[PDB]
Paper text:
In Drosophila, oligouridine tailing by the terminal uridylyl transferase (TUTase) Tailor of numerous RNAs induces their degradation by the exonuclease Dis3L2, which serves functional roles in RNA surveillance and mirtron RNA biogenesis. Tailor preferentially uridylates RNAs terminating in guanosine or uridine nucleotides but the structural basis underpinning its RNA substrate selectivity is unknown. DmTailor180–560 adopts a conserved bi-lobed nucleotidyl transferase fold consistent with other previously determined structures of TUTases. The N-lobe, also known as the catalytic domain, (colored in blue) is composed of five β-sheets and two α-helices and contains three catalytic aspartate residues Asp278, Asp280 and Asp343.
We initially crystallized DmTailor180–560 in complex with the non-reactive UTP donor substrate analog UMPNPP, in the presence of Mg2+ ions (DmTailor180–560-UMPNPP). The structure was solved by molecular replacement and refined to a resolution of 1.9 Å. The UMPNPP substrate is bound together with a single Mg2+ ion in the active site located in a cleft at the interface of the N- and C-lobes. Multiple interactions facilitate donor substrate binding and contribute to its specificity. Tyr390 forms a π-stacking interaction with the uracil base of UMPNPP, while the Mg2+ ion is coordinated by oxygen atoms of the α, β and γ phosphates, Asp280, and two water molecules. His522 forms a direct hydrogen bond with O4 of the uracil base. This conserved interaction is a hallmark distinguishing TUTases from PAPs that has been shown in Cid1 to determine specificity for the UTP donor. Thus, the DmTailor180–560–UMPNPP structure reveals a conserved mechanism of donor substrate recognition consistent with its activity selectively adding oligo-U tails to the 3′ ends of RNA substrates.
Numbering used by the authors: 202 to 416, 420 to 549
């Protein structure tokens, strides 16, 4: 514990190499993948496959995840939420056995169909998923019955489009995480929220709470999933031109910030969007819907007694890094420190 975990060579080679890849090559690819014809085919085939099994039931498919927000690549999976029976606005604190049952019933169709290959069936994840290759396109699809990802995907799109610097940084840190082999502890989504929070502290992104001042709210259970698509100019937020030197400097400060962050006392909190949000105080700073929810359901409050706390800005009871261990956090912090050193001018 007294020794820093050495930054893996595969990451080191990417950092000391020019960041020009993302600006010139990976960004155009990521932006194209927000919309391609292949997704239409997948959604159609999913409807063709499943609606026979649920003939008299409403059915809609939603695309979400890294491809749809604009930080994906060629090899990314496509994340799909299949809503059977208009469950969109229903929130399940934990995947209900009925929901698992629904997914199990859906698995059979992928095994018997010719256009699909069942790759994996994951019942015991936070979000149970069917992992299946859409053979006509070769795209690996992760199919779930949870609407929240679609909702926070629409928020990230608004953020990325309003402040492209955010998207460049998420592409960079996503690749960094993969080269550091930290994906088992710190997910792409977690680090996306950390980029967003870091830029909120630079007065370049709004607190999400400032986009949900109600006058109306769209809810999934107790969570407010819509938001006002405010002009950044009416928020006084300047929209930066992303240049290689601008991205490099913000990346350097991003890594230095999370290298020195106090994870024992503070949490990453894009909902509040302010510095030094205390773990001991966050639950009283959340609004009436959260307060009422945990009052009646104390067991569903955010998990704060964990090495690393990164709060989802919509599903406010979700610590996205709740799985990070003491040593996983140490590794992340050590890598951030060495990365910042390598990015120094
Ligand atoms: O803790 C989590 C993880 C994931 N998600 C939601 O699930 C989506 C897909 O989750 P994901 O694990 O596929 N992460 P993603 O951003 O797609 O990146 P990649 O590694 O390229 O797949 C994310 O983009 C979020 O919308 C959550 O809402 N909470
Ligand atoms: Mg994904």
């Amino acid at each position: 514990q007294h020794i820093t975990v050495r930054l893996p060579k595969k990451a080191r080679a990417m950092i000391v190499g020019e960041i020009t890849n993302v600006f010139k090559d990976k960004y155009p690819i990521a932006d194209k993948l927000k919309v391609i014809p292949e997704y239409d085919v997948i959604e159609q085939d999913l409807c063709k496959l499943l609606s026979p099994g649920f003939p008299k039931q409403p059915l809609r498919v939603y695309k979400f995840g890294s491809r749809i927000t604009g930080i994906g690549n060629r090899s990314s999976d496509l994340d799909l939420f299949v809503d059977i029976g208009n469950t969109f606005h229903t929130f399940e604190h934990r995947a209900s056995n009925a929901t698992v049952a629904k997914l199990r019933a859906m698995r059979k169709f992928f095994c018997d169909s010719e256009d699909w290959r069942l790759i994996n069936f994951i019942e015991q994840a936070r979000v149970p998923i069917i992992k299946t290759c859409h053979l006509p396109t070769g795209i690996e699809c992760d199919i779930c019955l949870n609407s929240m990802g679609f909702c926070n995907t629409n928020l990230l799109k608004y953020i990325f489009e309003s402040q492209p610097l955010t998207q460049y940084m998420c592409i960079y840190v996503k690749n960094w995480l993969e080269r550091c082999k930290l994906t088992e502890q710190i997910s792409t989504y977690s680090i996306t929220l950390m980029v967003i929070y870091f830029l909120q502290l630079q007065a370049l992104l709004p607190p999400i709470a400032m986009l949900q001042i109600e006058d109306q709210a769209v809810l999934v259970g107790p969570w407010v999933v819509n938001f006002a698509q405010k002009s950044f100019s009416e928020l006084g937020l300047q929209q930066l031109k992303a240049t290689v030197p601008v991205i490099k400097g913000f990346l350097r400060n991003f890594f230095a910030y999370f290298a020195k962050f106090d994870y024992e006392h503070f949490l990453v909190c894009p909902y509040i969007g302010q510095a030094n949000v205390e773990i001991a105080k966050i639950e009283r700073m959340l609004h009436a819907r959260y307060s009422a929810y945990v009052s009646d359901n104390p067991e569903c409050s955010i998990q704060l007694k964990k090495p690393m706390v990164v709060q989802d800005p919509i599903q406010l009871n979700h610590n996205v890094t709740k799985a990070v261990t003491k040593y996983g956090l140490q590794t992340f912090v050590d890598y951030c420190q060495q990365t910042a050193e390598l990015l120094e001018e």
